[PDB]
Design a protein around this nucleic acid. Structure first.
Ligand code: MG
Ligand code: MG
Ligand code: MG
Ligand code: MG
Ligand code: MG
Ligand code: MG
Ligand code: MG
Ligand code: MG
Ligand code: MG
Ligand code: MG
Ligand code: MG
Ligand code: MG
Ligand code: MG
Ligand code: MG
Ligand code: MG
Ligand code: MG
Ligand code: MG
Ligand code: MG
Ligand code: MG
Ligand code: MG
Ligand code: MG
Ligand code: MG
Ligand code: MG
Ligand code: MG
Ligand code: MG
Ligand code: MG
Ligand code: MG
Ligand code: MG
Ligand code: MG
Ligand code: ZN
Lengths: 208, 124, 99, 85, 138, 104
RNA sequence: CCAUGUGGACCCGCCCCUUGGGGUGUGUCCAAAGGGCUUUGCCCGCUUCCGGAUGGGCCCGCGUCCCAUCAGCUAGUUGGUGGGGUAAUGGCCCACCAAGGCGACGACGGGUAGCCGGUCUGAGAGGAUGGCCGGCCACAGGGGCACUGAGACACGGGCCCCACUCCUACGGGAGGCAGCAGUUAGGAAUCUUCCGCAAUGGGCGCAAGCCUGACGGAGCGACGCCGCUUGGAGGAAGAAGCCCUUCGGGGUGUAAACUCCUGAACCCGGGACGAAACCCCCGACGAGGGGACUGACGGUACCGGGGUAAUAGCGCCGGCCAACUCCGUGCCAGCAGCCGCGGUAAUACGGAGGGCGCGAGCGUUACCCGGAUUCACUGGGCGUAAAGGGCGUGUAGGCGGCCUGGGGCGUCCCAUGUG
């Protein structure tokens, strides 16, 4: 299935915050905040040089975890941007944002990505006016990501549809706060997304 | 060479020889045991590694390593045989799969298991 | 046993025994045309030739010889009789023969 | 004889049919001599039926026999229509 | 015996240069002349002059070089960094247009014999024909 | 276009028949130098006209015997023994390279 | 069997074309069958003839694995004239005559394998492979043979012998799944004696219809690819227990406990597309129009409502190779793909805690390619590293100087047919 387990420990594995714990992950709690060093018995001891391949892999893992999809199809998404006409680093992401489970988490309707998924899986979501239980979902420019009326008066929807009067979307996006709607303007750029990944280093792991 | 030399003579596609005979195509082959013994090892080493010469169902009479601590192998115990030679002992080039047929799985095995035909012991 | 099948072999038998009668008539008859052709009886050979040539064609309407294969046996005979009468005497009838 | 019929090119529960000109005795979905259109019987599109009339109108001056199904799909294509007075 | 009129030239001018000889002389062909007019159309060589060496017909090619480099090896740079022939004899090399390659990512030249003659991949493809693929400079 | 072949006769020693040697040139499949490989076509010459060493064209035709599938079109040149000698030199040399032997 | 014969076939004759193609002149020979109904005309048929299309036989050009430790093979063998045979050319087959044919550009023998579209690998060049689907081939227990027919030399047709099984009254006869499904055998391994002819396809029929183990679907198998759940939001300066500790303390670890939220499964109901034809009346039997029949998947998919927190498992952690420590053991027991670890401080063996990688899969074994520019066209080398014949001669073959012109075989170019 999906990975399911001790999430804020990769808040610390690759050494920087991955906001996957979600609304806690802006505390002086999310695990990183306390103890930067990554897991078990040794995590505090002196860390030596990382192999050329170490680093090659770290920065791949980060981007795989951070987006909350498992390897086997993190691949067919890479290998589907390769097969596509344009910059490979920049196409890749481009079809991470078009996935449904992170079409929500940037459209507001959730606290973290792992949560944001549940709402997709469970019949809660509208796509060009229909119900989609499919995180694997290719959201195109002009699509309509909303909520089905039935779930609307749920707290989790709403405390989150709240806070959005203090934030903004992401410039490829209109949020319709009140009407509970959302619109996919275009794809992103590598202009926008300021992730803590370096993407060529990802591709240099999918060269070997 | 010259072009012509080759045009006349040419490049002789290399030939591949399977470091594992017995398995006529197969990945495993069941045989009955013949000898059940132990032979001391090669040169930098020292042990008393455990082995069994096994008549086959491909005709042959090949000798086999028993991977593991304990074993249950007697002169007529059916077995199963996979590739993977031994840099300690010469003439042995296939192993015996633990756990299939009259061959034991090793008791007292928590870690490396799936190889050793030993199941899961929870309520541990 | 499968009575769809058996049907067609009993069938066979009956046509073989009409196809035998057909051919083994024509051999016979046309051999006795070659024969009268040798010693120049242009009267009689040219008779036999036409009662050959027809028993040909009517085995050609049928399924014994083909139009291709029956036309054949017409040229075997017709020509070879026009020619045995070379080494003898001129065609009396001119029945199955175009001067 | 020469015939015009239907040949499967979908999968389980998802048939998409092809219009074909092919020799009678030929295997169903086999080396046909001419593709003259498709027919979507699950009809999931605006274009769930194309034919092109002018070829089936050579192909019947030809003397290629339709099915029932395929016959009905040609009348409905315009294939068999007449005009003037 | 002497086999390759062509490959020979390259190897004179090769060995000529890598010595930094001002001038060098090669057995007058019609080919060797038309290949040569290229090699100065495209500035690898200053130019060839027809000169008779011992009342025998010949071509005098003058050699182009780099500029006085410094360092501890003050020896310039053959404008001809590598020249070498592809259609070798008994082993020939005919490319269409499709098959005409480009050399050093466009920085370089491939020489052709075509139905319209003495051609560079640029001049070659611009013209839309091909043939025996000859040598290769840069 | 019932194929047309230009080759030089190398065998008279038969009835209304004759052997012809046609050759072709081409880049080697992989190694790709021009090579030149040839083959001999038992032609049909009825009236017997063409003789031992002629330069002929042949065309694919209605089978005449077992290995006769070419009639002879026309003559491009007569007298060309140069090759007939060459072809016989090759045919000869088989006398050598045997594990019967070859004597001095 | 007889006649009529629009036409066709054959013999001979001329006239175009030119391998047996098209016309024409005389002689000669051949046709048929009737059933049905809306009966004085419509339908399914019938016979001879040119043609369309369809499918197919046969022949040639190039392509088509290895070993020369197989170099010489050939007597129906190669060709000729006559003949037979076929839908048709031809040693295909027979008679008779001449002595040919083939081969190192691999004849011959031996070994192996159906071939291809494509499929896997690879930067490419090649290397590996031809289950499924599709195009061509070849067989139907082994072998030879002909009949019927447009067609085969015929899997569920026929004649003969042999092996094998079986009935027998000891004369004799029966039998052929490599068609679906299953049994047995073998083997590391390969499934239901399922539903239905609704769809589509085929045979036959004027039609309703009839046969359809093709096929359409279901069953079983993680075997493979993809889609999906095992929760999520909150939660301690951080429980117990388990491991390390330099006894201060470090780690599993916000993970768990509880707080809140969502609701796979299940329950209730509704509930398909896939199917409009053939048929029937109108209308002309046509074009067009109207009516009727029919679902094996299936009471599935999918829509409305209801609802429980709700499977985790394998490999690895000395180097290559992401992951480090305590005990136990002491060249023992054991790991291992390569070098290698173990002879009382083992990051390598077996356990624990901790760690990395993956997830309904994770590993091991077998095979294909890459790595391997270690078969080297791309892309290699011989002084000592494996390798220049001990030296010449010269045949096949490979290769070649300067000046102009004819051919255009190669090679380039454009249009086109095919793929
Ligand atoms: Mg529901
Ligand atoms: Mg017959
Ligand atoms: Mg009559
Ligand atoms: Mg009759
Ligand atoms: Mg009657
Ligand atoms: Mg075989
Ligand atoms: Mg490569
Ligand atoms: Mg193959
Ligand atoms: Mg198949
Ligand atoms: Mg059998
Ligand atoms: Mg047989
Ligand atoms: Mg059968
Ligand atoms: Mg039907
Ligand atoms: Mg499954
Ligand atoms: Mg399994
Ligand atoms: Mg999956
Ligand atoms: Mg939680
Ligand atoms: Mg409908
Ligand atoms: Mg490491
Ligand atoms: Mg281990
Ligand atoms: Mg220790
Ligand atoms: Mg250990
Ligand atoms: Mg290679
Ligand atoms: Mg080397
Ligand atoms: Mg040496
Ligand atoms: Mg020596
Ligand atoms: Mg020359
Ligand atoms: Mg010239
Ligand atoms: Mg040309
Ligand atoms: Zn977090």
């Amino acid at each position: 299935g999906r990975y399911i387990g001790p999430v804020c420990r990769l808040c610390r594995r690759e050494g920087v915050k991955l906001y996957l714990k979600g609304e806690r992950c802006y505390s002086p709690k999310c695990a990183m905040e306390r103890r930067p060093y990554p897991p078990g018995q040794h995590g505090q001891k002196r860390a030596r040089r990382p192999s050329d391949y170490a680093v090659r892999l770290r920065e791949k893992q980060k981007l795989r975890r951070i987006y909350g999809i498992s390897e086997r199809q993190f691949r067919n998404l890479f290998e589907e941007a390769s097969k596509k006409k344009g910059v490979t680093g920049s196409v890749f992401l481009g079809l991470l944002e078009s996935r449904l489970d992170n079409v929500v988490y940037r459209l507001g309707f959730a606290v973290s990505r792992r949560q944001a998924r549940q709402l997709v899986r469970h019949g809660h979501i509208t796509v060009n006016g229909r119900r989609v239980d499919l995180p694997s979902y290719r959201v195109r420019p002009g699509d309509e990501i909303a909520v089905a009326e039935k779930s609307r008066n749920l707290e989790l929807i709403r405390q989150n549809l709240e806070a959005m009067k203090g934030r903004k979307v992401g410039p490829w996006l209109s949020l319709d706060v009140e009407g509970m709607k959302g619109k996919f303007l275009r794809l992103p750029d590598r202009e926008d997304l300021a992730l803590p990944v370096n993407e060529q280093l990802v591709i240099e792991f999918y060269s070997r | 060479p010259t072009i012509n030399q080759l045009v006349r003579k040419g490049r002789e596609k290399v030939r591949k020889k399977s470091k594992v005979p017995a398995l006529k195509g197969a990945p495993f082959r069941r045989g009955v045991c013949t000898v059940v013994r132990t032979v001391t090892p090669k040169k930098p080493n020292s042990a008393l590694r455990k082995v069994a010469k096994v008549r086959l169902t491909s005709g042959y009479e090949v000798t086999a390593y028993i991977p593991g601590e304990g074993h249950n192998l007697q002169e007529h115990s059916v077995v199963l045989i996979r590739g993977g030679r031994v840099k300690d002992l010469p003439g042995v080039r296939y192993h015996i799969v633990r756990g299939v047929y009259d061959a034991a799985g090793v008791k007292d095995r928590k870690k490396s298991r799936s190889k050793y035909g030993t199941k899961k012991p929870k309520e541990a | 046993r499968n009575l769809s099948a058996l049907k067609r072999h009993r069938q066979s038998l009956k046509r073989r025994l009409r196809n035998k009668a057909k051919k083994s008539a024509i051999k016979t008859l046309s051999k006795k045309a070659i024969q009268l052709a040798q010693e120049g009886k242009a009267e009689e050979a040219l008779k036999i030739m036409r009662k050959a040539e027809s028993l040909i064609d009517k085995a050609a309407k049928g399924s014994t010889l083909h139009k291709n294969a029956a036309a054949r046996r017409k040229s075997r005979l017709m020509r070879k009789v026009r020619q045995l009468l070379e080494a003898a005497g001129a065609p009396l009838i001119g029945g199955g023969l175009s001067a | 004889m020469v015939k015009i019929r239907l040949a499967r090119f979908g999968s389980k529960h998802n048939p998409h049919y092809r219009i074909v000109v092919t020799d009678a005795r030929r295997k169903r979905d086999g080396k046909y001599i001419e593709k003259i259109g498709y027919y979507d019987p699950r009809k999931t599109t605006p274009d769930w039926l194309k034919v092109d009339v002018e070829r089936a109108r050579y192909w019947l001056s030809v003397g290629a026999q339709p099915t029932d199904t395929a016959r009905r799909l040609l009348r409905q294509a315009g294939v068999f229509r007449q005009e003037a007075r | 015996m002497l086999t390759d009129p062509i490959a020979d030239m390259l190897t004179r001018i090769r060995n000529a240069t890598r010595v930094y000889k001002e001038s060098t002389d090669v057995p007058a062909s019609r080919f060797k002349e038309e290949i040569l007019r290229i090699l100065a159309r495209e500035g690898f060589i200053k130019g060839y002059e027809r000169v008779d060496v011992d009342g025998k017909p010949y071509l005098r090619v003058y050699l182009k070089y780099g500029p006085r480099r410094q360092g501890p090896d003050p020896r310039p740079e053959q404008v001809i960094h590598h020249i070498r022939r592809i259609s070798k004899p008994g082993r020939r090399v005919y490319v269409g247009v499709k098959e005409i390659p480009r050399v050093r990512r466009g920085l370089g030249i491939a020489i052709l014999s075509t139905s319209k003659g003495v051609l560079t991949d640029r001049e070659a493809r611009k013209l839309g024909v091909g043939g025996e693929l000859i040598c290769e400079v840069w | 276009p019932k194929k047309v072949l230009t080759g030089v006769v190398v065998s008279d020693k038969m009835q209304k028949t004759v052997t012809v040697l046609v050759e072709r040139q081409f880049p080697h499949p992989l190694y790709g130098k021009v090579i030149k490989r040839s083959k001999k076509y038992l032609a049909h010459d009825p009236e017997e006209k063409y003789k031992l060493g002629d330069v002929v064209e042949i065309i694919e035709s209605r089978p005449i015997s077992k290995r006769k599938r070419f009639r002879v079109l026309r003559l491009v040149e007569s007298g060309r023994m140069d090759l007939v000698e060459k072809y016989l030199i090759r045919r000869q040399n088989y006398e050598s390279l045997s594990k019967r032997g070859g004597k001095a």
